[PDB]
Every structure is written in structure tokens, then in C-alpha cells.
Structure 1
Amino acid sequence: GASRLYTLVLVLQPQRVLLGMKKRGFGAGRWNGFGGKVQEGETIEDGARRELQEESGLTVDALHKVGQIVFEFVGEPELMDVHVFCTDSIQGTPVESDEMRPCWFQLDQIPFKDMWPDDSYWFPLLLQKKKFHGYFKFQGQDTILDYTLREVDTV
């Protein structure tokens, strides 16, 4: 059915990944990658690049598509169609703003308990350079009712 396009960008380097603690809005209190809605007349990749700069202060060269995840919240008519990207070549330094507080995390210290619960399923694939298609059904913001997750050759 009808789905709204979102982007999600993980700045993932060999020994660390950047996450930002979302200060306000839906899902505040959790460490997120950077992203959001795509604009009219904007390609998905261009929106991910824009949202990364807007939210982290970072400029990136190459963006690699690594996943597509569809989220359903029970009772909510709009599905979230989230296009996940990764990058390791960035320019700039992340900046705390009144919307997000950024921190680098060692790969063995990902704060899964303070992240969206679906991250525990697909972040491991992201970390092993796998690509994936995912679907997660939520009841509220805390409980996964069911899900599917499949490794793919083409996102």
C-alpha cells in the first residue's frame, strides 16, 4: 500500500560508526542514523545526502545503498519505506544541535539497548557489508510483533 519515503544514513568507518541521539520528536531518546523525508522533485540519494548534511554537518562523496526496510505501526495508515545508505568518506565534524547529539561508537559497543529494536536484527548485516530487504511490524515504539529480513544482492 501507500508508503512514505525516508532515508537513513550510517557513517560507518572500519573501527567506528556515528550515531546521533534524537532530542525531540518521534522516537526521541534513541540513537539514530541521519535521515528523514525525501522532497518533491528530489531523488532518494540526493535526499539522503541533504539530510546527512542538514542533521550531522557532514558532507559525503560516495553513498552506497545497503538496505530497504518497510515499517508498519499498527493503527497507523502510512507505511515507512526506509532506504538505508552507508558511507565511509565524509568531510567535516559532527555538531551537537538542539535536535541531535552526535557520538562515535566503537563497533563492539553499539548501544542497542538505546536504539530502535529493529536495529538488533539488521545492524549486524550492515556491519558485515551485507545488503538487505526488511519488514518490521511494530505495536507502539517498543514491541516488534513480526518481521521479515532477507539478505539481497541488489537493494
Structure 2
Amino acid sequence: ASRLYTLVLVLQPQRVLLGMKKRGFGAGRWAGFGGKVQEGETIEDGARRELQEESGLTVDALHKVGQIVFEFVGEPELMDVHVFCTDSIQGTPVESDEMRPCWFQLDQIPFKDMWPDDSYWFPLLLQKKKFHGYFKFQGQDTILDYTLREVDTV
């Protein structure tokens, strides 16, 4: 019914790293780093791998911050996105053919050029709150319905 994905936010005291995807799902938007979890791989190991593949950064500890289920009307598979954050990274962000990373000051997060759901849950991430969310999309731009609640255990 649902497919596992990861999403990683590199969140430091005064800035956050986002990546501009050049192609595929979500191209043209700033977003966290992530993708599909593989066979035999833990969700956290998948999150660490995708962060390296897409940003060039090596993460140690990842902290669970949320879970968001996305439904796209007309598509059978739900996306079960496990969201993580970290403030301890090594390496410097790498631009590739697939992704352009850039740091943003927290007061300059580019919500108009991000997925629309981020405007709801990013403020929770910034205040170190954990959450469970569900967003029903029509296409890539329109949220038909959603739920979002803070939780103690992701």
C-alpha cells in the first residue's frame, strides 16, 4: 500500500541546507535530501546513503523528526516518508548533474519554491518538534486535504 522513503534536513543553529533537484520527481524545487529505501536496508541507513548520494555530505547520528504519508490522487502507491535531521556533518556540499545544494538562513527559507507541505511542518522541525503528517495532493502544487500533529515518539 505504501513505499518507504527518507528525507534528511541538515539543520544547524542558524541555517539549513536544501537541494534544488534538476530532474525527476520534485525537479525545480528546494527540498531536503532523500529517496527510496532499498531491500535489506534500514530506513536510517537509507537516509544516510541518500544524503551522501545527493549532497556529498557524510552524516553520523541522524535524529528521527517525523513521518509524512503523501497521497497523489490517481496514483495507487502512498509515499511513507521518514524525516530525519542532523546538525553534525562532514564534507562540503557537492553540486552534481542531479542536485544543487545551498545553505539558507532560517529567516530566508524559500517556501514559495518548496513543496507546499513544507510550509506546515518545517516550522515544527525548526522548533525541534516531532510530527506525524498526511497530505493528499492533486498534482504537485495543490494540497486537497491534510492532517498534521505533534508527537512524542516518531
Task: Tell whether the structures are fold-level matches, with TM greater than 0.5.
Answer: yes
Q: 1:63, 1:26 → 2: CA distance? A: 24
Q: Which 4+ stretches in 1 moved above 4 angstroms?
A: none
Q: CA deviation at 1:11?
A: 0.2
Give the aligned partner of residue 107 of structure 1. 106
Please state how far the C-alpha of 1:40 moved relative to its aligned partner: 0.2
Distance 2:17 2:131 in 1: 20
Per-residue deviation at 1:80?
0.2
Shift of 1:115: 0.1
TM-score by length of 1: 0.99
Q: How many residues get paired?
A: 154
Deviations 1:118-155 (A, max 9, x none): 00000000000000000000000000000000000000
String of CA shifts for 1:82-141, please: whole Å, max 9, x gaps: 000000000000011000001000000000000000000000000000000000000000
Distance in 1 between residues matched to 2:54 and 2:141, nearest whole Å: 24
* 1:27 positional shift: 1.6
Q: Give the Cα–Cα distance (whole angstroms) in 1 for the partners of residues 142 and 12 of structure 2.
A: 30
Aligned equivalents of 1:40, 1:151: Cα separation in 2: 30
Structure 2: 5+ residue stretches without partners: none
CA distance in structure 2 between the aligned counterparts of 1:58 and 1:27, rounded to whole angstroms: 21
Q: Give 1:31-110 correspondences, 5 Å limit.
A: 31-110=30-109
Q: 1:86 and 1:24 mapped to 2: Cα distance? A: 24
Structure 1, unaligned runs of 5 or more: none
- What is the Cα-based RMSD across aligned positions, in Å? 0.4
Deviation at 1:26, TM superposition (A): 1.2
5-14 or 54-63, larger mean C-alpha shift: 54-63
* TM-score in terms of structure 2 length: 0.99
